[PDB]
Ligand binder design. Sequence first.
Ligand SMILES: CSC[C@H]1O[C@@H](n2cnc3c(N)ncnc32)[C@H](O)[C@@H]1O
Ligand SMILES: CSC[C@H]1O[C@@H](n2cnc3c(N)ncnc32)[C@H](O)[C@@H]1O
Ligand SMILES: CSC[C@H]1O[C@@H](n2cnc3c(N)ncnc32)[C@H](O)[C@@H]1O
Ligand SMILES: CSC[C@H]1O[C@@H](n2cnc3c(N)ncnc32)[C@H](O)[C@@H]1O
Ligand SMILES: NCCCCNCCCNCCCN
Lengths: 286, 286, 286, 286
Amino acid sequence: VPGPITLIEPLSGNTSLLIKINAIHSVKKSPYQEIIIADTEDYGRVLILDDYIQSSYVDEQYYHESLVHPAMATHPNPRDVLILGGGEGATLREALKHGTVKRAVMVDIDRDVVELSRAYLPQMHQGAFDDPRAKVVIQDGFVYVEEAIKAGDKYDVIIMDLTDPYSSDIAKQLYTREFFAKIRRILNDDGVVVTQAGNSFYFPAEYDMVLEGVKANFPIVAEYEVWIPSFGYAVNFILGSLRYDPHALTPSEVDERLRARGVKTAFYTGRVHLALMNMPIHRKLR
Amino acid sequence: VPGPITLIEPLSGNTSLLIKINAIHSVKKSPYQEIIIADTEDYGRVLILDDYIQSSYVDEQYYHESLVHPAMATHPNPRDVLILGGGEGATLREALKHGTVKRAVMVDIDRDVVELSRAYLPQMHQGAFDDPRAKVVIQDGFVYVEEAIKAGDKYDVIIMDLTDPYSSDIAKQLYTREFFAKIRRILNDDGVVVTQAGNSFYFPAEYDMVLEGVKANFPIVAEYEVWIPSFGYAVNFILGSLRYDPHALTPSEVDERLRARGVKTAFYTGRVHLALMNMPIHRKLR
Amino acid sequence: VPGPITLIEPLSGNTSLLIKINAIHSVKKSPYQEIIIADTEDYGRVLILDDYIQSSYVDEQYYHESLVHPAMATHPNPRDVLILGGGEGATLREALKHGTVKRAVMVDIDRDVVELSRAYLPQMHQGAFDDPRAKVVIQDGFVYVEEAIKAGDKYDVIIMDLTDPYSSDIAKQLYTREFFAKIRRILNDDGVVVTQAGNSFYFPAEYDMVLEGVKANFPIVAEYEVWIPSFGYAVNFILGSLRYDPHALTPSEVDERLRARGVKTAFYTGRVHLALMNMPIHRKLR
Amino acid sequence: VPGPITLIEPLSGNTSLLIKINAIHSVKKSPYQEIIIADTEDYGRVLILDDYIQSSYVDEQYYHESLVHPAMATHPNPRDVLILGGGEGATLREALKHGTVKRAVMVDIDRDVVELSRAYLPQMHQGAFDDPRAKVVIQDGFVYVEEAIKAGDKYDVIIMDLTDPYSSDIAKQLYTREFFAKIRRILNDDGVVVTQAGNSFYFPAEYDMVLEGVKANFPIVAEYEVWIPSFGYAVNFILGSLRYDPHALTPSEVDERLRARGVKTAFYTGRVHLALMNMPIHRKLR
Ligand SMILES: CSC[C@H]1O[C@@H](n2cnc3c(N)ncnc32)[C@H](O)[C@@H]1O
Ligand SMILES: CSC[C@H]1O[C@@H](n2cnc3c(N)ncnc32)[C@H](O)[C@@H]1O
Ligand SMILES: CSC[C@H]1O[C@@H](n2cnc3c(N)ncnc32)[C@H](O)[C@@H]1O
Ligand SMILES: CSC[C@H]1O[C@@H](n2cnc3c(N)ncnc32)[C@H](O)[C@@H]1O
Ligand SMILES: NCCCCNCCCNCCCN
């Protein structure tokens, strides 16, 4: 039973997780957030920001593969990729696997998350930060997107891997209808956006606000979720597309794009893609 | 932060859930298990057996529909149904929705679970216990199956809705290779068995033992899982079939059987079926 | 870890107690406070007010005997006794044991605490509420003392058994310098006051405020403490005397007063009295 | 709730403490026990062995002074002192304050406790380990006492500061009748033994076993307790004496021995001694 040293991970406010801690690797009060890197018995090494597990060694591939590959596989030739957040470098790692990618930009507000992840979470980034195709920019993603509009920059796929919409003051401006309109302005005509949107079961109001924002700006929208044990819930993803429908890809087409692009995964396959496109998201039923 | 009255729900031993309790309706130490019916803020009313949530008002339909309908929809004409466990009566409720069912027998070892569920959990059974097609038998499922073999009783679908294989002494004899051989002897030649098998991520050894038991006795075996928030995990299900392959059903075939049989659901559909058949089960990836 | 049903009892705010609950007897939102009467495995039946255990079956006699008998034994002939609080009736029970007592008045603000204690905590009051010498008044103790001054009422011993000074808004006016001045005005010239004063170790600032209030109004002040397991701390008592010094009583004199007055106890004796007068109170030493 | 990083300190099994951790300094799985040195908000720096707090910066002086000084002050000229356990070096620190002491031997089974205490808990040992009068021996205390009998060694005062009798497999042989007989064989004819004996309230059976073991071997036995906040209980001590009765010492005699011997304390005085000798130990009263 889960001690003697325990993380109390908030889940809903009326439910919390008690997680056995084996070791604390680093604690850093950054100007933006409290960072903890720790070893958990169940999940191995974790990044914690303001008390919330962001990623674990034993299940981060479920999160990062589900966040990245459906969007990347839906785009027929994703060359220019923008990531907002993704501080541990695993979102960048998954995006770079696509041989079509020539330029991947990752924008995180917090240099301490990136530097502490570089040192203490090598199985997350796996060298992604040092890939010649990758540029790591330390900036508020809101400001970065405003400056990208003025420069008329355009991307094929935009991946939002931010802190939770229901908890995170630093990410709140990037989850609005108005921000999704700004995202559309820096997408090519066949562009795709994907974002994590917290949890539809425990935080339906915050989830619905994000969903309405994407639906108001993109004509094709897929909603899918994946159980991440270390989070205590099935994370919700919202994918917005200007041309291509992720629901239209067959397992064979997904598997052929992965093979052609040199993409190796622990989890994501054509069959996973089909399941994600067909499983409705969880809500409270009474 | 949950309290002042809290349920400490074990999950893995290295992770536990802290769940705020609004009221305790009943506590009963039966000879078989400790029974608690309580109101939780997140999940509404719950049945707890030996500290483990069995079912909640807000998400039990995810559990009971996922346990019952894939097996029932795979059988082309399920007339005789046997349920082992299912004390709250929701498994019986779901099976009875199939208009093909003429006889449903439910066998639970613990009369106190059934009677406390009848009184305190009416939204679970919804009158299923009193359906003219239903017989509720209080007996050890092991004993009932031995007596069914000697009587040469035979069923189209057998549903095992027992306490967890990783925790429950009272159910341990019903999760063995030898017990699945006994189940095959009370199935018709085109019969199907489904059982909950705990959790593949947190309890892989106990999950694998159940899987090997089913694979040794049945030529067609499907594995699928669904996130149940009140459990803290995606419950694993194992379906054993003598003739019909659930992987072969299309969404349209599932939806046509549901329509023809008068089956109304909150969750299960042809698309859910397709997703369950295509989503690999969770394991620790590192 | 204690469960599955647990009380999270706040202790210091940086430490809390997890207490196994076997049953909840009553929950009542009164106009003043939330009341819970519950069975704990370690402490048996408890009264809880706003999350704080007030008393337990297994250790309340340590609390009530330590609160009452040192003051009562110090007064050479206590005839008129006033109790502020003491909702469960055990303070009254201990005071009434003194054969010198002719009139005991108990004043609690909360009729629900008294009535629920009468019904659900009979081993606390043990009939004290119905003793012909006893008068139970439902009133704010602040108002009762103002009206006692105007009537020129006077008492030999005043016992304050209120909710904690560090947590309880309803009692806060009764813990001030100004309130102890009002108490002195309704004491005879040889009168004694005793109050519980929370805990000197975990709540030194609130303890010190009560102590300065008593020292400003009374020339003789004794401080003593007793470990109450169900509280998670040694409760602090402050005794204010106008004439008689509890430090001057010998074990033999205490034991003779108890014998002469027909006082039977589970804990308090002359030797206990000597120990209480000689044990310094706990503080943080670093 | 105290968090996000928490120590779950077992107390009774039906009560546990949740203690906020500010930092973890060191974690060592020794062959004998799990060792944690941590900073707590309430208690400052702590040593934890197998989940149990052994000592805290804010209250260890209550524990170590109460364990050592009553026995040392009862002996009229304690020259040779043996300590079994006392890994953090505070028991040794208190014993060495007595100017009569020429030789103090401290025997702990676990070199990791001693070395981690030397480095991370300097306010506990305060250089005691390096005092010319002190010998620190890493050995099982059982073996050390058997070898002391064979060498015919004799001591004036033996202090047992071991892990708890109710929890600690490594110490269990040192808490038996037979072990107290071995202790008597290495005492001078006016010798005194003192041991911590867990807690009489929460662990009465284990406490009573230790008490019967001492009473079978020593004609004078004193029982006393002190509240240690960081433990969640009043630790019980049992003192066994061959000639001198600690109940016979007056405050003045104790204070004169402390003054003559150059003993400076934060807590222990003649009045404390009197209180310890007069306070009965806590038991469940219903
Ligand atoms: C750990 S993956 C989540 C990341 O979101 C990042 N993040 C939060 N808010 C913003 C923002 N406004 N702009 C960019 N990155 C952000 C955090 O710094 C964290 O590393
Ligand atoms: C609440 S659903 C799980 C049910 O499994 C039941 N159960 C456990 N073991 C057996 C068994 N051996 N035979 C029948 N029912 C059982 C329990 O009594 C519970 O009601
Ligand atoms: C349970 S024993 C302590 C009692 O103090 C009572 N109490 C708190 N505030 C006041 C007050 N202002 N006057 C009288 N009783 C009070 C509470 O109702 C409780 O029953
Ligand atoms: C922390 S103070 C208690 C000490 O008792 C020690 N201890 C436990 N069992 C024995 C034993 N059998 N012999 C010597 N020391 C022991 C532990 O190593 C610990 O440092
Ligand atoms: N939950 C209560 C913690 C109990 C810890 N027991 C005290 C151990 C005494 N021996 C070592 C004390 C430090 N020298």
